[PDB]
């Protein structure tokens, strides 16, 4: 289950990264000063957003752009924490074997 | 196991920090405007990237530089979450002793 949800989180994260990159460009174009207006760097922004690396070179300036951003943040946070939860359940189970329980 | 994988994650993280610092300079040089072009600050960038401290003073501007960045992010995220998972298994085991189970 934990391994499945982890893999499910990864494939969902990828989808969100792709869709989020596409939706960002669509939302940002039309607003003067926006830098998130091309797909290649938008995808790079999506990775930055999901990981929270905080380079701060690219960010949305519109309402819907920021809404897309939030979805990517939470998706990244949920995913990277589901993996942590999956790794924990793995270690907990292995500990319950090296003690014979 | 949990303690081993934690130590394994730390030594791998260090390797990724070193290699990532070297690969970044190799990838960034040749691209006008790049600041990630010297090894000392590239190593500092690697630590920033793995921890996600988000100072935003240094970041790659090339495709392969960004690819190196992603590997460091995930390595840092995996490592710092494996340690969390290891600490959790430690506490869970100790709780199963103070209750006599």
């Amino acid at each position, epitope marked *: 289950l934990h391994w499945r949800a982890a893999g499910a989180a990864t494939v969902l994260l990828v989808i969100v990264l792709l869709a989020g990159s*596409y939706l960002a*460009v*669509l939302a*940002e*174009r*039309g*607003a*003067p*000063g*926006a*830098q998130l*207006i*091309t*797909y*290649p760097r938008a995808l790079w922004w999506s990775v930055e957003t999901a990981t929270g690396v905080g380079y701060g070179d690219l960010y949305p300036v519109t309402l819907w752009g920021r809404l897309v951003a939030v979805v990517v943040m939470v998706a990244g946070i949920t995913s990277f924490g589901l993996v942590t939860a999956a790794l924990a359940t793995w270690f907990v189970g292995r500990e319950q074997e090296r003690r014979g329980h | 196991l949990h303690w081993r994988a934690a130590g394994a994650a730390t030594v791998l993280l260090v390797i990724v920090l070193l290699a990532g610092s070297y690969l970044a300079v190799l990838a960034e040089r040749g*691209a*006008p*405007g790049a600041q990630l072009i010297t090894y000392p600050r590239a190593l500092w960038w690697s630590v920033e990237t793995a921890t996600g401290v988000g100072y935003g003073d240094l970041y790659p*501007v090339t495709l392969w530089g960004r690819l190196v960045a992603v590997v460091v992010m995930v390595a840092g995220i995996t490592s710092f979450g494996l340690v969390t998972a290891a600490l959790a298994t430690w506490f869970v085991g100790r709780e199963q002793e103070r209750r006599g189970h």
Partner: antibody
Amino acid sequence: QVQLQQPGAELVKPGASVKLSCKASGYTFTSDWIHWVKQRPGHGLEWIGEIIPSYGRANYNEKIQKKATLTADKSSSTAFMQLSSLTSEDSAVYYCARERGDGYFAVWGAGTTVTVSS
Amino acid sequence: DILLTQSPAILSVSPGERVSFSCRASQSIGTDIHWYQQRTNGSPRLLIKYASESISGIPSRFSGSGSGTDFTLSINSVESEDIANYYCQQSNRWPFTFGSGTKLEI
């Protein structure tokens, strides 16, 4: 093969309107944006607006008077530009261009010479 | 909006020499600049994308350099077919904008 096909010329009466077309061919991606550029005789290039056919979303130049309305047909792969209430100031060559969503205009149409007179 | 200044407006060069077109942005745009050529009665044609990247079908005597706010289009050994107007265009911030244009003269 020619990727963007525009009619050679369009004669318009002052006050009337005209609907320019831009039939496309070649590779088609959802990331494709169709742009329109105005060039008056002896002048330079002037970005009018853009549109993404796979959504119908359109953006326009805010620094100029809005004379244009962008639409597209996904089936016939044709982009449309509605110019309304035209004066002599609107007499120019109107180009259409295709952008892969990476910032540059790879291919241009031959351009439509729009003349506004009675 | 990003302002792109192309000075001078006209360049007079002798056959075989190396010429350089200038494009200055009103603010830092990295390397998000693109160069186009337009001959008489012709449509614009992409010469250089992202400051220095080459385009297929374009003669190798065309090159580009620069970053930030200062960009240069260079033609190596200018010949008669290079006689045209040259425009630069940025894609860093919305909306996209063009330079005033520079005419080559032999």
